[PDB]
Amino acid sequence: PDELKPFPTVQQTIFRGHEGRVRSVAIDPTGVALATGGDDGTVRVWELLTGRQVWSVKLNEAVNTVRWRPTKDTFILAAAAGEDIFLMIPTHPSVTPALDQASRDILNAGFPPGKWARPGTRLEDEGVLLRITVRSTIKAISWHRRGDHFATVSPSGQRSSVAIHTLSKHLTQIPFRKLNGLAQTASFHPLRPLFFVATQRSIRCYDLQKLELVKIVQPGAKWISSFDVHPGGDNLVVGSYDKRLLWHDLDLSNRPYKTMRFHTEAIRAVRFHKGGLPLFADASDDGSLQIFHGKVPNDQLENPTIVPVKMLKGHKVVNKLGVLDIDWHPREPWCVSAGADGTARLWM
């Protein structure tokens, strides 16, 4: 292209040793490490470039999501396994006695919609300092930018489905209880203190200030698989089992600005590239990730520009399923995908 560039093109690295599909991938806040939750029930931490596995732990029965505490002050990893949330401190070169102590004092500070307890004996020996139990199995986990608040979504959870957790008081609460249907997943706003909750039909947006609805947006899909919010906050992107991907401009309208079908199979994951670059990718049940370039001029008066830059293949479709997750490197334009191969793959 003329200038679009970077974009991921080829797969430079493969992460192996997960038996069974890899459910999730999360890149370190400082971008030197990769986290992968397994269907084997193991959380693994890897050196990003080499593909070396520097750490693993068996929580146990599958790990659905892994997310880092989005602060470089900590190095704290969060996992969702069955009904428990595990806050842990991976053994890493990046973890010194100082940083270890710091994160330990972040987790230990603050010593039932959720039940906070020490996982006990063997688990705390391996660096897992916390377990939070809710009453229905947890699909999604999201962090707030400052890293004190984190939300967990449990689709079958009836109305305790969307839960917001404060790490300070060890406080689980279930606000704005009130929805139109089953909650798939949730997200915090990048700038303002807002909150997004995606159901199967629609994506509702609440203000944590007044604890009530601000704006409801309709993607126009039969079932929402997932979504993600732009760093600017003014735009987001939705994706579905309807094979279609929808760009939503929240300034211009509450129904999608653009619709794209690049896939013959369901889209299981969608992620913007946080931290400055006009890249976003979506993952499909065919082994392909589709990489788009898109740009918000953040002075408004003009519409965002969307073009697909790539289709990344090489994930093997294994037992009916394709790529289950994506995550972006913080600075560099590298992405990492979690497929049903039992592998994670690095793309540059």
Binding site: P6, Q12, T13, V32, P93, S94, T96, W334, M348
Partner: protein, 452 residues
């Protein structure tokens, strides 16, 4: 139908003073004929030397007037022909089998840096043509001293016994007596190495150096002025003393607080965070020992004065840099930068435009090393499971993406295994080029030896 020709050369010890003058038969004339002409008693009086030829920066693989025919160039005009010593192909010879991934490889030889350092002033032994050693660092957490014949003389101490507490990312020979390594334990360890009459050695750690918070991914040494510098994932470059004699006291908040025996724990005599992203490479300047070059993922190569903490220059490239190496070539060097973008950028730190780009690697270039003989040449090694040999005298104008470009002269594959997608199983972590030559360790758990 004859054609006149003029030889030119960058080779230091081979030149025809007036005799650049010749008229030649261009009939079935190729590399061969011309090479046997240069070797003739009338010209270089070498007589055995394989040569290759570059017209305007391009190898001649074809017949000379088929060359001037294709380009449409007239018959009678003269073709100025650069001639270079043709690289003797480094085919496969030996393999040293490890238990885990090989992170680092270095060679102790008479012409190797540590050999030249140990030869002078002694306090060490100048290595004999018989006795060469090959150091290998592994993700085991184990250093290994190897025979030239490929046997293990000695292995570094275990675990609790004072060895590394994690994987070893990098290692080098500072002298035949002393060697240095670094790893995921954030420590830089300095080792004393002695060898028995019968062949078994001992590696006793002399020094544990804690300056870093992060993995130490790169290590470079100077055996003369007894100094180490390290590139770490914290975005910092450490500068260290390998002697217990002069070392600063460690921070003590970086210390572990196993414990079989105690070796002196010391800090860096300098540490500098000059990088936004993890620092991938740190090297001494080939000539001035007080100047260093840093490479990082922040796209920067930084010229760094070791005297002060100062950074005297900064050079920004288009992609994150995973490796760096200096070639002599002029009292300042020419840097080579291995990239995440699969290229190798040739960079002049002197007072930014790139001289040329080395293209054709399929993955991240994690290691580099200059040729021991003709130094317009260099070897690279990369996560695609290959080591590629380049000649900088070979150059072509860029096409779709810009300048000037050099394609590889030779390609060294992994004999352990089509070439597997990405780096699967084959990744090359480290390459060193000696006159024993081209030792390459990596993910396939072996050190491969290639020479002619």
């Amino acid at each position: 139908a004859q054609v006149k020709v003029i030889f030119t050369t960058t080779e230091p010890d081979l030149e025809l003073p007036e005799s650049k003058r010749q008229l030649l038969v261009p009939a079935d004339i190729r590399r061969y004929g011309l090479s046997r002409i240069l070797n003739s008693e009338s010209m270089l009086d070498t007589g055995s030397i394989p040569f290759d030829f570059l017209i305007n920066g391009s190898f001649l693989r074809s017949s000379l007037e088929d060359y001037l025919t294709s380009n449409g160039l007239s018959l009678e005009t003269t073709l100025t022909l650069q001639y270079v010593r043709s690289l003797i192909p480094p085919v496969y010879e030996a393999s040293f089998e490890h238990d885990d991934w090989v992170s680092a490889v270095d060679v102790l030889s008479a012409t190797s840096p540590a050999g030249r350092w140990s030869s002078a002033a002694n306090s060490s032994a100048a290595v004999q043509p018989g006795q060469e050693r090959v150091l290998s660092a592994s993700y085991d957490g184990l250093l290994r001293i190897w025979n030239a014949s490929g046997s293990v003389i000695a292995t570094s101490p275990s675990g609790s016994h004072g060895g590394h507490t994690a994987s070893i990312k990098a290692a080098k020979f500072l002298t035949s007596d002393r060697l240095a390594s670094a790893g995921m334990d954030r420590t830089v360890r300095v080792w004393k190495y002695t060898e028995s009459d019968h062949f078994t050695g001992e590696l006793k750690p002399t020094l544990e150096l804690y300056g870093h918070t992060g993995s130490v991914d790169w290590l470079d040494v100077d055996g003369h002025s007894k100094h180490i510098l390290t590139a770490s994932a914290d975005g910092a470059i450490g500068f260290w003393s390998a002697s217990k004699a002069s070392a600063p006291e460690p921070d003590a908040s970086l210390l572990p607080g196993t414990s079989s025996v105690s070796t002196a724990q010391r800090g860096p005599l300098g540490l500098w965070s000059i990088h936004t992203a993890p620092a991938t490479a740190a090297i001494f300047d080939p000539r001035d020992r007080t100047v260093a070059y840093s490479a990082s993922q922040d796209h920067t190569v930084r010229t760094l004065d070791l005297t002060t903490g100062q950074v005297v220059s900064t050079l920004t490239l288009t992609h994150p840099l995973l490796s760096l190496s200096a070639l002599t070539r002029t009292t300042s060097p020419l840097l080579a930068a291995g990239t995440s973008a699969r290229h190798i950028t040739m960079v002049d730190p002197r007072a930014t435009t790139s001289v040329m780009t080395l293209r054709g690697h399929a993955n991240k270039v994690v290691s580099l090393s200059p040729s021991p003989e003709n130094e317009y040449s260099l070897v690279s090694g990369s996560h695609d499971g290959t080591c590629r040999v380049w000649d900088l005298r070979s150059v072509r104008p860029a096409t779709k993406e810009e300048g000037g470009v050099s394609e590889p002269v030779y390609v060294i594959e992994r004999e352990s295994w089509k070439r597997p997608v990405a780096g699967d199983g084959c990744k090359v972590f480290s390459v060193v080029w000696d006159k024993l030559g081209i030792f390459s360790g990596g993910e396939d758990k072996k050190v491969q030896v290639n020479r002619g």
